[PDB]
């Protein structure tokens, strides 16, 4: 079938060096799509001849569905026609930066990209922000491209999910692939609320199974909610093979489907759970056709409703931060 | 189906990084094969504690064919009941090292692990070097190992393969995949010798394609040959992940099978072409049933006979290197 087109940003960095080879190998869009890359990185010397190293080790792998790749330093020419858009690239946090300086930095980043995609990208391009924040930086991308449907940018929230996923399937013995309706709800942060209460395994409930709530708050989410500084700190760096792993899975499940599992996606507000319109939050969908849906009627208790608030009290601070970038 | 066992060397490295999420993933052995990772690493803190993250990340992307994972710091338990064993870590050529002490460090190392996989293997293991110089290193294990068959000690000359395969779907301007009977003679090395002698391409013969010796004697072998060192200095650092890619093909279509198709292979020289018996040596293949097959009845003309010839001299100078720790 006809190749898509995928641009990718940031494509000299780490996330991306563990994700274009899988996403030429097939494992994002399947295995009989071609895909055309189209990648992005700083107009800088050292950087763009990185990038023309990265090219060369694709080409020297041999990928059967590689109908193309191409390298660019503009956003414009990046995003041309392009179907999916995977936004990693991101200003980090670095030395005398304050909260509002990296807030700043980043949203000068994601109202260009937004602008481009809005003029040059496919009219139904589906974008994923990778890049932290990830949830405010989609949000900021999203309020830059007003004539493209706003359910189209979404936030991983999929490593916080398979993060969590792999510590309830730990913690019962059971294999992680048994588990159903496990879910994130926030921001991509250590204020996601991993919720297990209506999880199940082989149709058992995995809250009666492990029937101890103190492991959930004390063990459980602390846990998830701080692994990434706990692979900082056994590996001295990030962990880019799971968030490139993530990423892929995010695409997939949106674009095949989830054939009626559910799955976590920071997507746009509609109102739901009572999450302001247009805030960018982590929530249990089910996928079909290329489009996600809401789970809707979970019930929201007193623990919940004190998580949900604390996670969408942070993205509404950065939202607060950003918000005079977007006139 | 019943999992297989895997181990690997240098996991806590570069190429591991890239190469242990494909292998989980299921790219290796195929997609209804569960796989069991016994990773090794140097006994130190720092090393293991790496490789204590690596393997935090591997959980984290929740695989389905993962049916098990242990950490190592002894090759007598890291090989264990292995059915395959990919053997990366080596060591690197350092500063103040000449040639005979790189030839010396690392036969050191796969004397011992040679050692360990005629020990506690599979009667059958499979085993593919990848760290360099890797045609040495694999003979030094297979001379180590008296007990196992041979044959079963393998190179990878795949990543020469690889890139020879980019370089001619580029000048003819044909789809890689389109490419059959290329293939690599001698050591994965620049002394290396890629040959588009039989080539074809949609039964069109690739050398009449181009048209221009000149062009395979200046251009196309020095570009394969020099590869690696285009890369790290267009990237600063190895290539990993094509490493890692070479290294999955090589054990994919061993495993697998070529169904008729030519792949390179180092393997233990029978005598063909002239090659000594005993020295590991790229030579055309098809496999099939999980056993390789030479490629007879090739015409070697003088040029081939010349570059046939550096190379193995350059693969004599090594095993006269180290054969002396083959007491």
Chains 1, 2 share one sequence.
Not at 2 to 9: H, I, K
Not at 112 to 118: L, N, P, S, T, Y
Not at 289 to 318: C, H, M, P, W
Request: aromatic letters at 6%; a negative charge.
């Amino acid at each position: 079938k006809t190749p898509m087109r995928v641009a990718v940003t940031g494509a000299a960095g780490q996330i991306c060096y563990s994700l274009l080879f899988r996403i030429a190998n097939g494992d994002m869009l399947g295995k009989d799509q071609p895909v055309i890359l189209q990648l992005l990185e700083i107009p800088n010397e050292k950087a763009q001849k990185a990038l023309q190293g990265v090219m060369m080790e694709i080409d020297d792998c041999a990928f059967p569905l590689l109908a193309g790749m191409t390298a660019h330093a503009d956003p414009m020419t990046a995003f041309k026609d392009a179907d999916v858009a995977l936004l990693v690239g991101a200003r980090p946090r670095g030395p005398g930066m304050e909260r509002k300086d990296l807030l700043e930095a980043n949203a000068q980043i994601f109202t260009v990209q937004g602008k481009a995609i809005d003029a040059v990208a496919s009219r139904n391009i589906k974008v994923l922000v990778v890049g932290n924040p990830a949830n405010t930086n989609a949000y900021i991308a999203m309020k830059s491209a007003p004539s493209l449907p706003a359910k189209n940018f979404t936030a991983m929230l999929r490593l916080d999910h398979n993060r969590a996923l792999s510590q309830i399937a730990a913690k019962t013995g059971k294999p992680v692939s048994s588990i159903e309706k496990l879910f994130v709800w926030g921001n991509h942060s250590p204020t996601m609320y991993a919720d297990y209460r209506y999880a199940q395994i082989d149709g058992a409930s995995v809250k009666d199974m492990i029937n101890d709530d103190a492991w959930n708050r004390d063990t459980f989410l602390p846990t998830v909610g701080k692994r990434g500084a706990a692979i900082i700190d056994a590996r001295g760096v990030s962990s880019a093979a799971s968030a490139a792993n993530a990423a892929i899975d995010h695409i997939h499940d949106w674009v095949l489907g989830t054939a009626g599992k559910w799955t976590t996606m920071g997507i746009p507000s509609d109102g739901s759970y009572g999450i302001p319109e247009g805030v960018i939050f982590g929530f249990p969908v089910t996928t079909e056709n290329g489009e996600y849906k809401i789970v809707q009627g979970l019930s929201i208790d007193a623990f919940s409703q004190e998580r949900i608030n604390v996670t969408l009290n942070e993205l509404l601070e950065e939202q607060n931060g950003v918000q005079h970038l977007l006139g």
